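Researcher: Following up on the earlier apo prediction. This time include the ligand. It's zinc ion, with the SMILES given after the sequence.
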Amino acid sequence: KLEINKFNYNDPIDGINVITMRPPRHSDKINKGKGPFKAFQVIKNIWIVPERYNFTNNTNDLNIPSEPIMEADAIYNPNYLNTPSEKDEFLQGVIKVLERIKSKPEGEKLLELISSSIPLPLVSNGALTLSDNETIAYQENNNIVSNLQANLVIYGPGPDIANNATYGLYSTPISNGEGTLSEVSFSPFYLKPFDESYGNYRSLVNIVNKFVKREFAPDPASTLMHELVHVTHNLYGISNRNFYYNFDTGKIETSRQQNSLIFEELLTFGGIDSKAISSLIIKKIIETAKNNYTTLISERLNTVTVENDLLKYIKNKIPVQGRLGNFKLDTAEFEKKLNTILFVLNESNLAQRFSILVRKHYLKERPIDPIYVNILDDNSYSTLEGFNISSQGSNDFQGQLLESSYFEKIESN
Ligand SMILES: [Zn+2]
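Model: Understood. Below is the ligand-bound prediction.
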């Protein structure tokens, strides 16, 4: 069954699970000369790179922004994650969060799905053949030693050290059914609190009604699972980032409006706000994906004349019927898989299965200053229960209360 590879940051290069990786975005001018970076294969096709994410236009500068800040709850420190000790701490934190995710069946299945769901390769000489959309390069002394399969690369945070995000490598495959390698910027130790109503906390005696809004920290396993849901959409080539859902009208629009949310985020977060999506929207989303997949099967998959391992992996990813050269989409099985990855797989549903508290709405009503927490201390955070450790009396979400001693205040200027 699925195993997570353990590592220390100082483990030696072996060309199997420990490499020096050339950035996937190395050809962009902003990334000239960067890397390579030490990288660790935690699960087949999933790599951890203990470096700050600085490889896109909006992440290239790790300093305090030179323009009006995006988020009032951001925290900046260009020096975070530049020492070997911080890199090992980060590596251990990501491994621990992954072990937590794997500890329940829904999380194990999500990780297995990311591991196995390679992007649809290009065809060369009749064979599915790998590209940089499905691999990372092991670079040593300005030579490429090998190209190793990768569906996901997990880095540390970008400029805001308490933010988390997912980036698909190629922008047509992210949305046309092919799929694309994804990069995630993740912060296991710097967390953004949220408000939720709750009644089991120390309260002044003169307050009659105890059930009120209280501050909580998120479980970073929920935060990572949220990004892993984006990754799954990216690997299936079904991402929905140009569409906005307008809460006032219940319709999809192609530009941001007054009371709207990016549809990709509405679905990925889930919860109450996805329960009243119209049947029209759902049918359109399914038809778009079906049409994209039907086109890829006829125009690409049916040009394959060579049965290799990549074809086996693709048949496991994409439900098809028929024989070589004459495949067809297995409509019923495709619809079932698509509806799972779009409408069942989401942060709110996963959190319920892990007894993790998440906020009610993707958009927060007010910013709360980020905190630091050392999740490597098993007395604060365990792989089996997160912060909500029963033997310490912290089950039923109590361990996520922000007043808990392990949530440490950060002073920012
Ligand atoms: Zn998101």
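Model: Helices lie at 84-102, 105-116, 220-235, 263-269, 279-299, 309-317, 331-344, 347-353.
Researcher: Noted. I'll compare it with the apo version next.
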